[PDB]
Amino acid sequence: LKKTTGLVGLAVCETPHERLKILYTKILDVLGQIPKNAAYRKYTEQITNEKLGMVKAEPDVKKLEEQLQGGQIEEVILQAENELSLARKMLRWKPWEPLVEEPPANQWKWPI
Amino acid sequence: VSDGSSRPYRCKIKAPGFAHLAGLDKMSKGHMLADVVAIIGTQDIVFGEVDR
Amino acid sequence: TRPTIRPRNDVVHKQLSAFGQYVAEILPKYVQQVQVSCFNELEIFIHPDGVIPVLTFLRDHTNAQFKSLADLTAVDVPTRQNRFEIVYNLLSLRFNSRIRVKTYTDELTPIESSVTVYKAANWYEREIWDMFGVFFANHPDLRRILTDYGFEGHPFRKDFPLSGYVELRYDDEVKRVVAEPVELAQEFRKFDLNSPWEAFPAYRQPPE
Amino acid sequence: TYKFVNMREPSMDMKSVTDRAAQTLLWTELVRGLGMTLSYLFREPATINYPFEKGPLSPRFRGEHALRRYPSGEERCIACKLCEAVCPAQAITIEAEPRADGSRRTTRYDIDMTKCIYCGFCQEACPVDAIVEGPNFEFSTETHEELLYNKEKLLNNGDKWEAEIAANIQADYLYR
Amino acid sequence: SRGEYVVAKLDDLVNWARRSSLWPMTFGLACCAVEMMHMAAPRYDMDRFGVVFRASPRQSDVMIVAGTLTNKMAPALRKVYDQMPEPRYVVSMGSCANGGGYYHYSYSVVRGCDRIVPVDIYVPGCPPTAEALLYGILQLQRKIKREKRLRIWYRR
Amino acid sequence: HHALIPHGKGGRSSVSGIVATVFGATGFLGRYVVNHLGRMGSQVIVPYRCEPYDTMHLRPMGDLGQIIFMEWNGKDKDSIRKVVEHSNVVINLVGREWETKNFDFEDVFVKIPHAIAQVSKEAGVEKLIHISHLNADIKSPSRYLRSKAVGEKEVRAAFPEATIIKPSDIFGREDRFLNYFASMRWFGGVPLISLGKETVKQPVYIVDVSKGIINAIKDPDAKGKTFAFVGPNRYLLFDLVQYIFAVAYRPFLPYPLPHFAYRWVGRLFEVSPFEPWTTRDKVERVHMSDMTLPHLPGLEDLGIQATPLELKAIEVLRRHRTYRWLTSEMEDVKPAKTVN
Amino acid sequence: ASATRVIQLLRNWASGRDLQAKLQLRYQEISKRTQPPPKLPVGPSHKLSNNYYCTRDGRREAMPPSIVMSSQKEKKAVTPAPPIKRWELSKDQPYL
Amino acid sequence: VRTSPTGEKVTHTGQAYDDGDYRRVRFSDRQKEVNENFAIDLIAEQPVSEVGSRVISCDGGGGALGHPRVYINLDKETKTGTCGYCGLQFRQPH
Amino acid sequence: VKPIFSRDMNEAKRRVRELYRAWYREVPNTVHLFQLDISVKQGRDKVREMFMKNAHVTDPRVVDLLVIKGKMELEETINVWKQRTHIMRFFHETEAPRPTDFLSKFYVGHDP
Numbered sequence A: 001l002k003k004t005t006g007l008v009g010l011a012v013c014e015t016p017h018e019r020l021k022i023l024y025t026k027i028l029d030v031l032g033q034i035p036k037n038a039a040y041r042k043y044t045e046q047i048t049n050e051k052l053g054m055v056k057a058e059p060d061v062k063k064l065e066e067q068l069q070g071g072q073i074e075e076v077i078l079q080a081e082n083e084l085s086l087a088r089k090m091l092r093w094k095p096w097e098p099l100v101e102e103p104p105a106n107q108w109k110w111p112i
Numbered sequence B: 001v002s003d004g005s006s007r008p009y010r011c012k013i014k015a016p017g018f019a020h021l022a023g024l025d026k027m028s029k030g031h032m033l034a035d036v037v038a039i040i041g042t043q044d045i046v047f048g049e050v051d052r
Numbered sequence C: 001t002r003p004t005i006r007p008r009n010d011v012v013h014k015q016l017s018a019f020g021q022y023v024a025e026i027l028p029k030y031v032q033q034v035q036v037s038c039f040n041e042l043e044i045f046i047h048p049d050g051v052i053p054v055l056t057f058l059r060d061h062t063n064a065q066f067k068s069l070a071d072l073t074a075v076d077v078p079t080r081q082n083r084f085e086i087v088y089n090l091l092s093l094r095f096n097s098r099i100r101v102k103t104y105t106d107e108l109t110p111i112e113s114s115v116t117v118y119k120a121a122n123w124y125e126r127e128i129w130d131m132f133g134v135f136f137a138n139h140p141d142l143r144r145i146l147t148d149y150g151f152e153g154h155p156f157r158k159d160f161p162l163s164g165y166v167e168l169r170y171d172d173e174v175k176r177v178v179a180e181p182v183e184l185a186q187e188f189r190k191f192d193l194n195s196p197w198e199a200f201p202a203y204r205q206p207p208e
Numbered sequence D: 001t002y003k004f005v006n007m008r009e010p011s012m013d014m015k016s017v018t019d020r021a022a023q024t025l026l027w028t029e030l031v032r033g034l035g036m037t038l039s040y041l042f043r044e045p046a047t048i049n050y051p052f053e054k055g056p057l058s059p060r061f062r063g064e065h066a067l068r069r070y071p072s073g074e075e076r077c078i079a080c081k082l083c084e085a086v087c088p089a090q091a092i093t094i095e096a097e098p099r100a101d102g103s104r105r106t107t108r109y110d111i112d113m114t115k116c117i118y119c120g121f122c123q124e125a126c127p128v129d130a131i132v133e134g135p136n137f138e139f140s141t142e143t144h145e146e147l148l149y150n151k152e153k154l155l156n157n158g159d160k161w162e163a164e165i166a167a168n169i170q171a172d173y174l175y176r
Numbered sequence E: 001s002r003g004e005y006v007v008a009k010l011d012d013l014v015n016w017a018r019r020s021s022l023w024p025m026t027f028g029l030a031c032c033a034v035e036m037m038h039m040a041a042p043r044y045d046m047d048r049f050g051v052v053f054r055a056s057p058r059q060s061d062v063m064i065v066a067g068t069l070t071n072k073m074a075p076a077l078r079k080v081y082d083q084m085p086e087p088r089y090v091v092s093m094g095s096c097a098n099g100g101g102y103y104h105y106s107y108s109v110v111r112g113c114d115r116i117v118p119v120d121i122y123v124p125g126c127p128p129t130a131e132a133l134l135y136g137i138l139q140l141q142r143k144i145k146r147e148k149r150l151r152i153w154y155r156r
Numbered sequence F: 001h002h003a004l005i006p007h008g009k010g011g012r013s014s015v016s017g018i019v020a021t022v023f024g025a026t027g028f029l030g031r032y033v034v035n036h037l038g039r040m041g042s043q044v045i046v047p048y049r050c051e052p053y054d055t056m057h058l059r060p061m062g063d064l065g066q067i068i069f070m071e072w073n074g075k076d077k078d079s080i081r082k083v084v085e086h087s088n089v090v091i092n093l094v095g096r097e098w099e100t101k102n103f104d105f106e107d108v109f110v111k112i113p114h115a116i117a118q119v120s121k122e123a124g125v126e127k128l129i130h131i132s133h134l135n136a137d138i139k140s141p142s143r144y145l146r147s148k149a150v151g152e153k154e155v156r157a158a159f160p161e162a163t164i165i166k167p168s169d170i171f172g173r174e175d176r177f178l179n180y181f182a183s184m185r186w187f188g189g190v191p192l193i194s195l196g197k198e199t200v201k202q203p204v205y206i207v208d209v210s211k212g213i214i215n216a217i218k219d220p221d222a223k224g225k226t227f228a229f230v231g232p233n234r235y236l237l238f239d240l241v242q243y244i245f246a247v248a249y250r251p252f253l254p255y256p257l258p259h260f261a262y263r264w265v266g267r268l269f270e271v272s273p274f275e276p277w278t279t280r281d282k283v284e285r286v287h288m289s290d291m292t293l294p295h296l297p298g299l300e301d302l303g304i305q306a307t308p309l310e311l312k313a314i315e316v317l318r319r320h321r322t323y324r325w326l327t328s329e330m331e332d333v334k335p336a337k338t339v340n
Numbered sequence G: 001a002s003a004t005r006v007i008q009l010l011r012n013w014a015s016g017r018d019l020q021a022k023l024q025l026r027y028q029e030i031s032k033r034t035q036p037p038p039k040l041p042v043g044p045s046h047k048l049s050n051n052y053y054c055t056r057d058g059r060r061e062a063m064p065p066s067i068v069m070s071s072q073k074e075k076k077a078v079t080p081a082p083p084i085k086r087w088e089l090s091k092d093q094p095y096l
Numbered sequence H: 001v002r003t004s005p006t007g008e009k010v011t012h013t014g015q016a017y018d019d020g021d022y023r024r025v026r027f028s029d030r031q032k033e034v035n036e037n038f039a040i041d042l043i044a045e046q047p048v049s050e051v052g053s054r055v056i057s058c059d060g061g062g063g064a065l066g067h068p069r070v071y072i073n074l075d076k077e078t079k080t081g082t083c084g085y086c087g088l089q090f091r092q093p094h
Numbered sequence I: 001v002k003p004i005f006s007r008d009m010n011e012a013k014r015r016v017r018e019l020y021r022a023w024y025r026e027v028p029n030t031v032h033l034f035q036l037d038i039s040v041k042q043g044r045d046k047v048r049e050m051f052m053k054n055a056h057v058t059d060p061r062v063v064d065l066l067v068i069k070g071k072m073e074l075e076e077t078i079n080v081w082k083q084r085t086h087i088m089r090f091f092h093e094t095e096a097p098r099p100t101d102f103l104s105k106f107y108v109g110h111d112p
């Protein structure tokens, strides 16, 4: 059990595997509500399922951190929480819908 | 940003002191005036950079 | 070989192009165009409505963890109807990559504040409002930074003269520092330096 | 690649505890700082006896602007105005007309020593070596107008400092 | 006249006291302040000459305007100058303070501190070297040495 | 010969076309005159007999090169010739309310102005402006005003086309008129001869006087005319002093004093080697009621409407207020009774 | 320096270090102010043949940015770059 | 360095303040800074070099310390060739 | 068009009236704190003049932005961020009167 994560404000998680499992399952639950053909859902599910499979397969925190390549496992849980919040806000925003409006005629022309 | 001329069209300088002085308020919470002087010292702000 | 010319890294170019397509696919609602510069920099062009959604997507890990707002600024191109081009520079320390998201606005059209997403955009957006005339809606405190307390015009706007419209001096009669119309003793000498001959054929605009 | 400042744990053995207790009660570290200050008291001071002693400077020093001449005595300036063009602060005002001999000389050459940034440009830019920032740094004035130099003033400075300016240019001309 | 001699000697004493003890105020706007600190540094220590930096304007005798004076800062500079007791002397250091320097044509820069406050000695340079600033301070000391307040009082 | 076309928009960097030598510019009126000249863009040549430190306040008033300080001596004509050689206008504001060992009232108000006018006429200066108190008269009790009248006669003699401006007490921040009354608080009660009921005064604002001088320089008709500068309202001395103390929020304790006792007190203060707090001439001039001279043209002729004392009193007298009344607004004190 | 042996010992003991070995003030160790004239080398492009500027023109080799996607006309998830490798504690001094 | 009627020292540019001009006041108790050495006279004083070649090169002396090297045609007998920068004159013998 | 704060001119007029109320009540406090020598009536007249200068605006967004700028200025004045110089700059005391009749402009200078 690591004494400190090393980054101020981030505390060592006593039960990392359980927390990661719960967070990934919740992220998948939120993704389910999102339309099937939305790219966000497909990519996020792909990433989540890989992460959850890795978490379940490996019982050692250090080996899991090496496999995930997301930094210390506490940082991984923090990223999972961030993803969950994004997924929840995504549902409201509905980014998968077509472009709101095309830009003016020469709004991105440079040199002028 | 360059327009292809000999003079830059736009030059924006990102000064490290800008964001640190912006966060000075958050850092100062719960401290006294001397602590505020110390915090100003810690972020190493040169106001030529901040004001540009 | 070719010592003078800058070396080119195609690997980073392909990675940035792939991630740009990734972003365009995930958020087709707001992204209008994504281009990767030949110095390996990625730009995603967004509709003004998508600043908060696209920035929140970028900050949160949909395989992208841009959690640092390098800088926020605007470029005033008077020709365009939306004369102001808001530019966001983000840094992802997890993937050691930086991407740029750009949007447009007019003098009269507000753009949503990103203080919620990043929290470093308070002062940057205040500076954008002070120099350029862009107003950021829902900002915690929008006021002048870097300009005088009574300054009226918005500098950096390509209409504002470099010397301004007012000047400050101390007046003994009123025992006060008093503003006055600018009167330069040596008018700034405008130099026309552009050459009549084209320098870069690659960027030649179509004759139309 | 990365190093840990702090991140050290004190020993809990009775000897180390007693040492730290002595440090707290007997003020050892403050005494160490006092000893450092005393040692500095006994070290030789670094002050130079200005004005009698002057600080080191190199031949590439950028000081008061000066207008040089050829060995003949003809002014080197050929009214190129490129040195005016490269001035970052627009501190040089140049006007020229064909002189009685027919040569391209400057009727007006003014450097505002109050708008100048002493960048060192126009010494690199000027093609004929006419304008040179000389060694002088002690040209403070009691009025603002004294610092708005004129062609006559610049030529007088060049005549005054030509002996040093030529030697410094000789020293650094190969590096340029 | 004996009265003239007494006045001249008392004026000498007062001028010597004022020039020997010149206390600049801790006022530095811009890069020129760093050269001022180097002047305070051991190599050119100004304390040898009696120049001691004192923060309070009321406990200071000289204001050195080191750095660009923006239109925003000018009222504060004038306030600090006014609150400074007299005799008070102003030294303008650097091109930015002298006449605006690199930012002469900026909207936010006062094209010289002479516009806001009277200046006694102008030190050229950008940044002026610490030796140049010391030369300017000694020139101000000589200017004080040349003052004839009591002689003028006697003659008036 | 020395004629310059005006150029610019009237700013600091513009050329007004006015080259002036303001004698006695290191004084209450000189400061405002020089400031008004400099703001237009005029070249101001300042002759100074004092230490250069005292002239430093005028240095920022003009753009680079506009203000030239040249040392001059009133007794020496050659310095006057040097100062006035290249000027198209000369303004004489040299006057001391207290006599000094080296220079008495005769020298400051008669000899000096006469020498200035003669040297200006020789040099070729187009215009000359001279200042003499409105109450100036050859039979007046005060030596100051008597010498003022004699000097006016001599200046008109030397310079026939000379504008002579006769101003009343000029109230301003550096004034010795309002500050003089306010400073009387330190001595306890305010000594007044006859309690001030018998004296009527018409004070003039300093800025109005300076603007009048500048407009007179600009006005072509002003040549060879005597203008009287007076304020909008006439006040009894008692009412005016009471208003001064009210605006200063300082207790007013008027006590009548016999004229001879006041003259003796004035003699006591004359003893001071430094600038006297008050003089017998000061007491006489204060007691003397301001003359009414309808014949002479006034500020209205020059285009300036006189500012009332009520508007500008707070500027002069706020400093005399204590901490309690420092922030009190101007409107709290009602205008004093006016004898009009 | 010119310090006497007693003062040198006192200062060294007070500091806890040998101050004489490393002295802040500068002595004859400094480089001579006058130096032999230099002969600066030329650069790669100083050749009399095969030096056509078209080959070595960097600026003309710049190109307008490539447009990956334009609105106006399974796949594996991708990242901006490969994830950063964790830093390794310094061997010389892991803990200060 | 001639002196103007007003008593001012005319500059090499020929600048002198007319009696009408009011700007002469700036030197009332100060001095007008004029360089006594005039470039035209000194350049005239230099002897004309005689070279036996139709085209000669002037670098101003000192090589890289002088001025850009220029080649002067000396064919015309009537007029000496004059360096655009240096101002030195050359002519073919005879 | 997207409204800044008001969808129609009447709402912007309401906001403008609120801002005018705020300035009108603040004026005496400004005279007291800044130790200004102007009367309260004079400052309120200056406030009316500043409001009247932009009385020609007919677009709701421009009016809303003007109200925002006025609120920022009011915040500056309510605090002591603006000095007496800034407050008195609205009264152009130092500047000399500029004639507007054709003949005076013709006499004074070449300016149109």
Ligand SMILES: NC(=O)C1=CN([C@@H]2O[C@H](COP(=O)(O)OP(=O)(O)OC[C@H]3O[C@@H](n4cnc5c(N)ncnc54)[C@H](OP(=O)(O)O)[C@@H]3O)[C@@H](O)[C@H]2O)C=CC1
Pocket (backbone or CB within 6 Å): F023, F024, F025, F026, F027, F028, F029, F030, F048, F049, F050, F074, F092, F093, F094, F095, F096, F097, F103, F108, F112, F131, F132, F133, F134, F166, F167, F168, F169, F170, F171
């Ligand atoms: N209410 C008024 O102010 C009135 C004004 N006037 C006249 O207008 C002028 C107003 O000046 P005021 O506002 O009173 O301020 P001052 O009393 O300071 O005016 C005197 C000025 O002249 C100089 N001066 C004084 N005495 C001499 C002298 N003997 N020789 C040479 N120069 C001298 C002073 O400089 P320094 O200190 O160096 O001597 C100063 O610049 C005076 O001439 C006054 O008589 C007339 C009527 C009323």
Ligand code: SF4
Pocket (backbone or CB within 6 Å): D076, D077, D078, D079, D080, D081, D082, D083, D084, D106, D122, D125, D126, D127, D128, D129, D130, D131
């Ligand atoms: S080098 Fe100097 S003197 Fe010669 S043309 Fe250039 S600016 Fe003029």
Ligand code: SF4
Pocket (backbone or CB within 6 Å): D065, D086, D087, D088, D089, D091, D092, D111, D115, D116, D117, D118, D119, D120, D121, D122, D123, D133
């Ligand atoms: S060194 Fe002086 S003259 Fe030369 S470019 Fe710099 S500021 Fe201008």
Ligand code: SF4
Pocket (backbone or CB within 6 Å): E030, E031, E032, E033, E066, E067, E068, E094, E095, E096, E097, E101, E102, E125, E126, E127, E128
């Ligand atoms: S004069 Fe030069 S060194 Fe001094 S503040 Fe300005 S830019 Fe910096």
